[PDB]
Design a protein around this ligand. Structure first.
Ligand SMILES: NS(=O)(=O)c1ccc(N/N=C2\C(=O)Nc3ccc(C(=O)O)cc32)cc1
Lengths: 298, 257
């Protein structure tokens, strides 16, 4: 730890504090996740254990690289590669102009490529959101924060205190399914894809019921035909208003036939029918995919 | 499904990397397979008292064998190695794990909170944080999807035989998790229905009933001698209705292989 110079605080959380640092010997610019253990009366947090195990197994250009783990009696530090900004800051700068479709296409292709690797290596992210997605000046996007990530060698049971912020939560979680699946991660990206296009959160709910209703108002209220077993879900209510599906020309107006097709499959109600990362990567949407460089304001 | 074939291929790849040294207990001067068998059986009780998942139990045993493959431990500290591993397995697999104070309580104050926390750190250092280990449990569930309609008595029974194999390092350390999970399912299926290792599972794993025969012979002997074994916490756990009282089922006299 003596070889690192802290430069700037680049994010906080319960997980630990993330800083921008410089290796004084090699000059290598890293991101450091500080995890205070003298504070932690229960030892090494399950998130730090889950994030280190899983990330150090996940070597992919669309997954953040974990360079080191400096484990001491006093604190725990995770050393990672550095990336210039998160998709949230990029999205806010582009709220006036707009992210051009070739860059949306590049970004979703890469997110799907990282996610496909996660999933083929039995790992759920469970917290995909713009700020957890990091971009660089050379044109790449990578998945970050594997704090709530889990190995699904045996099915992952649902937990209330360890779920994604409402806005990117899947309808199954909200209706109380007993288990997670790869489909939660796909829904999250679908929300993020529509956000890149329309320049705003697709389902910006203030509560679990407000979250559902915003989903139901857009994709229509699901029924036993659309989603078999939905009326048997713990948090389901027959009293729910029965809205009709809005046309994707109104939902995502600047999106083409393929883009509208891929998103409709990414936002399928039934997790068994929802498109996989592997499948989406074969979608005609990505036939003409290129790697453009973004316009960064550092 | 898209990634299901890939996961099995990856776990098969990982189960070799996460395998402990087979004859590690030989280069271990103060501890033996009996101490290990007593320790693994005790963690079975711990799991039941705290309602932990059977994967949590499977991960702890892997961590233990791996720690003991690279670290010399005296009998006095063997239970501390086991407590820190169960705590680490619980932190990795449980929605929320039992607190450290509870782990110190189930050792009847044999160790301190500081000791448990220091051993956790040591286990993590020794295992280099590689805690996502493939287990018999993991390969059994991937195999169960090749049984439609499913027989929950076969599932419970394979779970039981799979668990028995955690107690006896000799001979189960010489078999990989996928091979025990194969033998357990064949022996479970054959005992309940009379059916054998399916062709869909032969194609999936690339394992013929002949390749499973050395493990299956041992898993069959363990099943026959199970009421006679010194360790009985697994037989008690599975005579419950939760696992359809499978431990109360009489094993077959012969397998006919
Ligand atoms: N706020 S901003 O200017 O848009 C911004 C945000 C984030 C960053 N970098 N973050 C990280 C980076 O470089 N490597 C990382 C590895 C892991 C994590 C994590 O949370 O687990 C975060 C980062 C830069 C600018």
């Amino acid at each position: 730890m003596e070889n690192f110079q802290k430069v700037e605080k680049i994010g906080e959380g319960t997980y630990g504090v993330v800083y921008k640092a410089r290796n004084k010997l090699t000059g290598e610019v890293v991101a450091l996740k500080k995890i205070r253990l003298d504070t932690e009366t229960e030892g090494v947090p399950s998130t730090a254990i889950r994030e280190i195990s899983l990330l150090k197994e996940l070597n992919h250009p669309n997954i953040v690289k974990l360079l080191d783990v400096i484990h001491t009696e006093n604190k725990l530090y995770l050393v990672f590669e550095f990336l210039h900004q998160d998709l949230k800051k990029f999205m806010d700068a582009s709220a006036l102009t707009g992210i051009p479709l070739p860059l949306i296409k590049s970004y979703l292709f890469q997110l799907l490529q990282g996610l496909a690797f996660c999933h083929s290596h039995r790992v759920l992210h469970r917290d995909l959101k713009p700020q957890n997605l990091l971009i660089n000046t050379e044109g790449a996007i990578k998945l970050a924060d594997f704090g709530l990530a889990r190995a699904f060698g045996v099915p992952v049971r649902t937990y209330t205190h360890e779920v994604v912020t409402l806005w990117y939560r899947a309808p199954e979680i909200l209706l109380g399914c007993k288990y997670y699946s790869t489909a939660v991660d796909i829904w999250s990206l679908g929300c993020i894809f529509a956000e890149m296009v329309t320049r705003r959160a697709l389902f910006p709910g203030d509560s679990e019921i407000d979250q559902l209703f915003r989903i139901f108002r857009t994709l229509g209220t699901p029924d036993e035909v659309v989603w078999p077993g939905v009326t048997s879900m713990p948090d389901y209510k027959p009293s729910f208003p029965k809205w009709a599906r809005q046309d994707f020309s109104k939902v995502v107006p600047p999106l083409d036939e393929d883009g509208r097709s891929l998103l409709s499959q990414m936002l399928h109600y039934d997790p068994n029918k929802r498109i996989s990362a592997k499948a989406a990567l074969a979608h005609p949407f990505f036939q003409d995919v290129t790697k453009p460089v973004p316009h960064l304001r550092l | 499904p898209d990634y299901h074939e890939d996961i099995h291929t990856y776990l098969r790849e990982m189960e070799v990397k996460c395998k402990p040294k087979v004859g590690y207990m030989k280069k271990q001067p103060d501890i033996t397979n009996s101490m290990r068998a007593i320790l693994v059986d005790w963690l079975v009780e711990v799991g039941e008292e705290y309602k932990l998942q059977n994967e949590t139990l499977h991960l702890a045993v892997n961590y233990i064998d791996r720690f003991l493959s690279s670290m010399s431990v005296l009998r006095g500290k063997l239970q501390l190695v086991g407590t820190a591993a169960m705590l680490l397995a619980s932190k990795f697999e449980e929605i929320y794990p039992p607190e450290v104070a509870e782990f110190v309580y189930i050792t009847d104050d044999t160790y301190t909170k500081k000791q448990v926390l220091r051993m956790e750190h040591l286990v993590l250092k020794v295992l280099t944080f590689d805690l996502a280990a493939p287990t018999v449990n993991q390969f059994l569930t991937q195999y169960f999807l090749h049984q439609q309609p499913a027989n929950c008595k076969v599932e419970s029974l394979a779970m039981f035989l799979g668990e028995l194999s955690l107690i006896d390092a000799d001979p189960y350390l010489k078999y990989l998790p996928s091979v025990i999970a194969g033998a357990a399912f064949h022996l479970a299926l054959y005992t309940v229905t009379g059916q054998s290792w399916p062709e869909s599972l032969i194609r999936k794993t690339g394992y013929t009933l002949e390749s499973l025969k050395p493990c299956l012979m041992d898993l069959h002997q363990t099943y026959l001698k199970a009421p006679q074994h010194a360790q009985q916490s697994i037989r008690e756990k599975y005579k419950n209705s939760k696992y359809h009282g499978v431990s109360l089922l009489n094993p077959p006299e012969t397998l006919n292989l």
